[PDB]
Design a binder for these strands. Structure first.
Length: 247
DNA sequence: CAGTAC
DNA sequence: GTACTG
């Protein structure tokens, strides 16, 4: 087939971008079968190709709830005080979700620890998590999992699921980042940059020092932000509910 | 770098 | 913009 469509075909593989798609085209690959049989694949790339059709589908919002609930009960078995809030497209109220991002924390700020591994293991035993892509357990106090899940029963597709465990100290900035949207987050951190601050999935800092070129040369001091709206306030912004946030 | 998360 | 692993 023509160049542009084939590049698009390859790019829709998880773990494959515009550079990988271009390289594969030079090798002479045109179809997904060519990639599956001849191309050197990353473990992640192998999974994305395996679930190519299912990953292209957006899911009904109801299914996202059904997934968030599946994770929630698995975690709450270990600790019933645990919080489980689905973010991303879901929290912003979209009728469809391309994936599910479940955020987890605990009010005491202690018992959230030691859940991440046990939770994933519990979900693997349940048959819920089917494949794993990336696991980053050295996010400072946060841990993030990138994997694939599938609800039980006939006629179920594989969905992409993100699970994140944060301390209650960072709960505000954690879901502020994960509900998005991406170009909402982009402009809040850009805004803080102007106000001499920095925003992140961990904290909103003030007093951040930047050089003449604006490169950050000193971190600021972390401002305690219990809720989302505390963050909105310190940035001199009118608050936006998540639905307002999609953009 | 490349791809990814929002 | 901020920031993680492949």
């Amino acid at each position: 087939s023509e160049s542009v469509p084939v590049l698009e075909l390859f790019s829709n593989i998880w773990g494959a971008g515009t550079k990988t798609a271009q390289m594969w085209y030079q090798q002479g690959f045109r179809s997904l079968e060519d990639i599956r049989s001849q191309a050197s694949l990353t473990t992640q790339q192998a999974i994305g190709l395996k679930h190519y059709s299912d990953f292209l589908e957006r899911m009904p919002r109801e299914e996202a709830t059904e997934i968030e609930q599946t994770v929630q009960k698995a975690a709450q078995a270990f600790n019933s005080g645990l919080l489980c809030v689905a973010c991303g497209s879901y929290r912003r109220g979209k009728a469809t979700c391309g994936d599910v991002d479940v955020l987890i924390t605990h009010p005491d700020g202690r018992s959230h620890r030691g859940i991440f591994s046990r939770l994933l293991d519990s979900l693997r035993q349940e048959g819920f998590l089917t494949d794993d892509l990336v696991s980053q357990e050295e996010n400072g106090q946060q841990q993030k999992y990138l994997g694939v899940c599938r609800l039980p029963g006939p006629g179920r597709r594989h969905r992409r699921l993100d699970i994140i465990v944060v301390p209650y100290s960072e709960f505000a900035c954690a879901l502020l980042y994960f509900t998005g949207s991406a170009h909402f987050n982009r402009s809040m951190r850009a805004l803080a940059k102007t106000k001499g601050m920095s925003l992140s999935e961990h904290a909103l800092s003030t007093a951040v020092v930047r050089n003449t070129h604006g490169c950050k040369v000193g971190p600021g001091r972390v401002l305690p932000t219990p809720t989302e709206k505390d963050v909105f306030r310190l940035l001199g912004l009118p608050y936006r509910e998540p639905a307002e946030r999609d953009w």
